[PDB]
Amino acid sequence: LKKKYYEEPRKGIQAEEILQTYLKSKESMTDAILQTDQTLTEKEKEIEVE
Amino acid sequence: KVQLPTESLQELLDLHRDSEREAIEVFIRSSFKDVDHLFQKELAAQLEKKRDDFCKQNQEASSDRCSGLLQVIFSPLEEEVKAGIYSKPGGYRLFVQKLQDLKKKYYEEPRKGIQAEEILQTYLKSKESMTDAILQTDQTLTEKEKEIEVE
């Protein structure tokens, strides 16, 4: 989706700054998905070990 | 008389109206034979343009101050999420309680100005995905603990 955003024309001078501000706003969502993945992966590993 | 951000739009408008009236009185005392009131219309247009500038600058100053304040107040909570403090059974409930306590703290802070609610709502909406990720992690861990206890 970042690659798709780069391909779009007529973004103007704030293209990078707005994208970086947006990506930074989604770091918490990324981290929450990571914690959920790790917790589920550990639970699957325990289920397989059991 | 104007110090930004102003708490209400109304206080800023009243200060503008008083200063505008005094400026019109200064003009009336130093003008004569204003054909078609052309100079008076020019003055009114200049005063309207200044009203719009100062209202915009107040919106910006209020937004920036509130955005910085939310970063200060909720920066520990964001770091606590990154460190996985809420990644445990019942951790979502603790995150929601801490989020409510920090909103209460943000409300107590003075000199937020007219964008206080709008900036806070925009910030809270940006953290819904983080809230949901913590909830999914809590549910998954709580189910795993329940299976471990059942086993």
Residue numbers in the entry:
A (entry chain B): 443 to 492
B (entry chain A): 342 to 492
Extract from the study:
Guanylate-binding proteins (GBPs) are interferon-inducible, dynamin-related GTPases that mediate cell-autonomous immunity against a wide range of microbial pathogens. Host defense against intracellular bacterial pathogens such as Shigella and Salmonella is orchestrated by human GBP1 (GBP1), a cytosolic lipopolysaccharide (LPS) immune sensor and surfactant. Upon GTP binding and hydrolysis, auto-inhibited GBP1 monomers dimerize and assemble into soluble and membrane-bound oligomers, which are crucial for innate immune responses.
Here, by applying cryo-electron tomography (cryo-ET) and subtomogram averaging (StA) on GBP1-coated liposomes and single particle analysis (SPA) on self-polymerized GBP1, we report an outstretched, dimeric conformation of GBP1 oligomerized on a lipid surface and in its polymeric state in solution. The GDP•AlFx-bound GBP1 coatomer was well recognizable in cryo-ET volumes of BPL liposomes. The protein coat had an average height of 28.3 nm ± 1.6 nm, which agrees well with the theoretical dimension of a dimeric, outstretched GBP1 dimer (~28.8 nm). We further performed subtomogram averaging which resulted in a map of membrane-bound GBP1 dimers at a moderate resolution of ~26 Å. Although the map did not allow for a detailed molecular fitting of the GBP1 dimer, it suggested the potential oligomerization interfaces: the MD and GED were apparently not involved in higher order assembly, based on the absence of density between these elements outside the dimer. In contrast, the dimeric LG domains displayed lateral contacts mediating the formation of a two-dimensional protein lattice. Within the coatomer, the overall shapes of the LG domain and MD match well with the recently published crystal structure of the GBP5 dimer and the cryo-EM structure of the GBP1 dimer, suggesting that the coatomer is comprised of dimeric building blocks with crisscrossed MDs that are extended by elongated GEDs. The GEDs extend in parallel toward the membrane surface, allowing the C-terminal farnesyl moiety to insert into the lipid bilayer. We show that the peripheral helix α4’ in the LG domain is critical for establishing the oligomeric interface and facilitates the formation of an antimicrobial protein coat. The farnesyl moiety can insert into the membrane, while helix α4’ is available to form a stable oligomeric interface via the LG domains.
